[PDB]
Design a protein around this nucleic acid. Structure first.
Ligand SMILES: [Ca+2]
Lengths: 21, 311, 355, 313, 25, 21
RNA sequence: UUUUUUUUUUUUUAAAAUUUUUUUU
């Protein structure tokens, strides 16, 4: 289905957030 | 930038239904040890009683698919009876000894993932009602109470021993909490549970017939998770590190509500050296701190649940 | 020159000892070491909540409003954070050694014990926060799953301050502070399974106890603070688990060295009023603060006692308190590291009346 | 980016190469605990003899105060009761008398294993040894079972409530037919190996004082497999179960053979001390945080043979 | 804010990025 | 020859996982 | 005649992440 896509999407959005550069 | 296992770990955790073959490999932390990742996953059909509020509780109790309770619409559920995974016997033993150290094939466990999907199967004209989902933080607890040490001299000698209880059940009621998903029954619902310890903490087994508010077996008004058939063949094994999923289905009089119920969950277990299952054990995945940090970040960013037409 | 070959393990005398079978394995072996190109870089930045976490932990009384928000680790979940302080006036009985024990038992401000100067205390009775009922329930069921409003807890901070209120002539004596690592424990003992046939059938069940209490005595241990009563004393407690470990509730009337109720010789933490309204809830992850006040005969020793604590709790979704729950602080590894580093760099306690 | 800290390096040496230095380098786990600890760094070195015509199991489990648990059985038979052999320092650490192990006499309130290893050093000659040493690790973990107990003796048959009793999972894996992973060498070759963290991250453990850690909550149950405190726990009782896995050594001796050896059991334990013990004078702050050492440790543990000849230490 | 001032002080004696190794996980 | 020598061997193939700036 | 470690080749066979076409209800 499309849940993984959603995860991937959110994953990009939180990209700059992480404690790792 | 994510390791192979790290990515698979995320897939298994959040999008279990999206894949044909399960990608899960376990938790990519510093455990790096001998584990056997049990992937319990089955599919059944449920029929909802007209004029009742039905509760499907998916709690991290190894060997159990979910717990069910049915009550009058608007009423308060009390006892949720477990439906075990057909695999229970092979994992935790059978017979009167089921679940105990003698027949259990594991000595420790931790949940890497747990999810559930409710796929309505009624026609669009006869069903009616709703689906509501939310998570409760179920945790085992203890109460210290007296017990008889010697029956002489009457009324006996006592000492304080510990009994087991469970906190959180009271949150399973007809009135859905702030964080929830509420929708038309026919649209179904899907969601995942997630780590509520801070590091996917390992859990020890605690074999019991029930996990209730009271230490008195069968207490009618005590809310509880109860092993079916008096634990003759399957007993509660313990409570995991993830939160619990609550599915509430309200079926009015005359409504014809049915659904396919599918549940998944990946559990890392420390295997007994001698079982047939040990053969399929191996080394925990390599350390991927990024995948871990990502998981803990991501777990907060999704709706409490989503319709099944988009799992 | 071969791949998946079994590994042999050197025989002592290759001529005097028959050959043993080479070692094999189950499941694939650990992957070949990771390359140094997988460079994951980190930005050392302190987050706002991480900073607040630090203030709440060490400088509890230094701000306009309690800054605490919780522990900024990977928990990142739904919590209810209790940020409170029990401020009350007390009097120390002339010619006694009074022990104010601040232990991480949710719902309780501290535990008290009075004893002859020089004597050994045994039972410390709890003094609850007025919020106890609100948090853990009321009535005979107080503390149990049915009335408790939380299912798990962990302490983010805890501190105590003793503020003398006597004048410079009427008082006399000392204040001493030190920390003890109080941890719950268990003992397996027999209990009756069936009363037939006499003397009955037994099985071994577990009972709860508590280790560390013996350290609460008139003789202060190496790591302590000793001063003139009139100078008061203040200090914080700190994490003794390794990562701010989450704790489960264990409702009991007492946490003692013995599983026998009221055992006079057994040292113990005891819920007041026979646990009719307030029972012991459990024991947290931080160490325990011990305050010993020695008041000679004729001395008038009074003071205000402040007990602080910040607790992260997993809430029941139905309490009236749930409306205040939210997501815990975002991961701040720097803050966490700072905390564990800093916790060891201060005097066991400091005078409160000098600040 | 960085490299090992001094303590981090010592930590690694203590963990894997216990017998290799002039003085035990161990100092504890270099994580973020950074607190007050009393660190036991000890090794129980004793002479032993394996009874001819028997399978002898030497189980090295993380039970504070005990060097190991022994069981003697007919060759091929199933061992069930492993009796503990305590370190002479037991009383000193956990108390003496009938109260041994309990809060009143115990000198610690919490513990965690930083390391544990075992080495079997044959002392037989080339004409008298005969048999084997099979070694493998098992994940022993305490567990619980909720069962009913009498609350009131009136009205008969009494009033009940469900209480928890303690058990232990993993023992069943200790049997004559070892797993394919096992190291099987000749007795004369001895054997050496280390145990390692099986907890999340070197988790701290609470004490659980008991006479036995068995599959059953019934004392002395003949068929129950169990770890048993010697002498009925009169002087030494089981203190609890640590965070590292358990080492299993099965020594097979036929009639007519003389298999003797010196047995070494090592262990490094970090403990939260009672502030009043005479041992407190040795407590101090645990090693400073060394994330590199930790990562290395967890990485390496899974990378060495289950066991090696003892003359390879 | 005397105690916090002290915390800040110590906080700087350990600010190196012994010293703080940003690599907490 | 001692186990340590062996540990050292592998200990050097290990690279690490984090770096700060 | 042995024990570890270290690489390159290919045929491989996989699992994973990305770009393009060509069929099929
Ligand atoms: Ca932990």
């Amino acid at each position: 289905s499309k849940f993984w896509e959603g995860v991937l999407r959110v994953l990009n959005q939180i990209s700059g957030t992480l404690s790792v550069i | 930038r994510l390791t192979d296992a790290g990515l698979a770990f995320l897939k298994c955790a959040f999008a279990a239904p999206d894949f044909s073959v399960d990608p899960g490999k376990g938790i990519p932390d510093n455990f790096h040890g001998r584990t056997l990742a049990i992937k319990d996953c089955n599919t059944t059909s449920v029929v909802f009683t007209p004029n009742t509020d039905t509760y499907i509780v998916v709690a991290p109790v190894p060997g159990f698919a979910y717990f069910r309770a049915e009550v009058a619409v608007g009423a308060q559920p009390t006892t949720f009876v477990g439906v075990p995974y057909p695999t229970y016997a092979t994992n935790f033993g059978a017979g009167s000894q089921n679940g105990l150290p003698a027949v259990n094939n594991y000595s420790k466990f931790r949940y890497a993932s747990m999810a559930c999907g409710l796929y309505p199967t009624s026609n669009m004209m006869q069903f009616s009602g709703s689906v509501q989902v939310w998570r409760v933080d179920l945790n085992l607890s203890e109460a210290v109470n007296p017990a008889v040490t010697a029956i002489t001299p009457a009324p006996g000698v006592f000492a304080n021993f510990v009994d087991k209880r469970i906190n959180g059940l009271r949150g399973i009621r007809p009135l859905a909490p702030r964080d929830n998903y509420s929708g038309n029954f026919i649209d179904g619902a899907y969601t995942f549970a997630f780590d509520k310890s801070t590091d996917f903490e390992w859990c020890d087994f605690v074999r019991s017939l029930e996990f209730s508010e009271s230490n008195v077996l069968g207490a009618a008004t005590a809310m509880k998770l109860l092993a079916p058939g008096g634990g003759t063949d399957t007993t509660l094994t313990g409570l995991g590190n993830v939160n619990t999923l609550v599915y509430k289905i309200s079926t009015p009089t005359g409504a014809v509500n049915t659904a396919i119920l599918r549940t998944w969950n990946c559990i890392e277990l420390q295997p007994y050296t001698d079982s047939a299952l040990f053969q399929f054990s191996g080394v925990s995945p390599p350390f991927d701190p990024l995948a871990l940090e990502c998981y803990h970040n991501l777990k907060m960013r999704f709706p409490v649940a989503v319709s099944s037409r988009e799992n």
